[PDB]
Amino acid sequence: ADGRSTRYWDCCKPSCGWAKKAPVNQPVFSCNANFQRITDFDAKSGCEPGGVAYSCADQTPWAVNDDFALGFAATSIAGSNEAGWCCACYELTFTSGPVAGKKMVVQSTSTGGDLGSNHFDLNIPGGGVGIFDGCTPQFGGLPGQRYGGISSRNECDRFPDALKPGCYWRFDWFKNADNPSFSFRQVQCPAELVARTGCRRNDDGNFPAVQIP
Ligand SMILES: OC[C@H]1O[C@@H](O[C@H]2[C@H](O)[C@@H](O)[C@H](O)O[C@@H]2CO)[C@H](O)[C@@H](O)[C@@H]1O
């Protein structure tokens, strides 16, 4: 199937970070203000007044080589629901922009709201906070516009150290692609991705595996 991508980073607790959202071993980890994992899955989101749980900095993208990357996304997939996509992994092959032909395997860690579409909101620090700014309360805020975030690579240098690597990836591996389209299929999650969220679905074994170069 084909879909559409956007980019974001709002610092909020991800929607698959609550129990009973899907058939998983444990929900996606959330983190405290200094990015340390928290073990109470019921902690209040940092995007709500008085909340303490934020997005973890290790749930950011990285390049394995020039044609293949790994990362995370907030998703809305036509024909399915949050119990079907939370913690599932998908292989994307970009079909437009400067990254056309490149592949990226992502794990869904949150939910978007685009009915009838296959929307993947890629986790990218500096990609834009959108409606909720959890980053201001967390550490003082991130630069950039609300929708779309920063403009140039040099802006990543003023970010907190734990979010710099994901910020640079947008300009380096991703070539600053602006909402590229893609074709995708559901795949078994790589161990590398499950290591950062802690969340593996019970039906993961019913899908094909991908070979990380
Ligand atoms: O609402 C989805 C997502 O949008 C992100 O901004 C988009 C914006 O909606 C689109 O008009 C513009 O062309 O591209 C940007 C970047 O993809 C926003 O950054 C996210 O917080 C939000 O979740």
Swiss-Prot record:
Which reaction does this enzyme catalyse, per its entry?
Endohydrolysis of (1->4)-beta-D-glucosidic linkages in cellulose, lichenin and cereal beta-D-glucans
Question: Tell me, which GO biological process terms does this entry list?
Answer: cellulose catabolic process
Q: Could you state a single Gene Ontology molecular function term?
A: cellulase activity
Checking InterPro entries in the record gives: GH45_Enzymes (IPR052288), Glyco_hydro_45 (IPR000334), RlpA-like_sf (IPR036908)
Q: What class of enzyme is it?
A: hydrolase
Record-annotated active site? 10, 121
Q: What is its EC number?
A: 3.2.1.4
Give the UniProt keywords, A-Z: Carbohydrate metabolism, Cellulose degradation, Glycosidase, Hydrolase, Polysaccharide degradation
Disulfide-bonded cysteine pairs: these are: none
Kindly give the CDD domains that the UniProt entry links to this protein.
Answer: DPBB_GH45_endoglucanase
Query: Which family is annotated?
Result: Belongs to the glycosyl hydrolase 45 (cellulase K) family.
Query: Mind telling me what this protein is named?
Result: Endoglucanase-5
Organism name:
Humicola insolens (Soft-rot fungus)
Tell me the lineage of the source organism. Eukaryota, Fungi, Dikarya, Ascomycota, Pezizomycotina
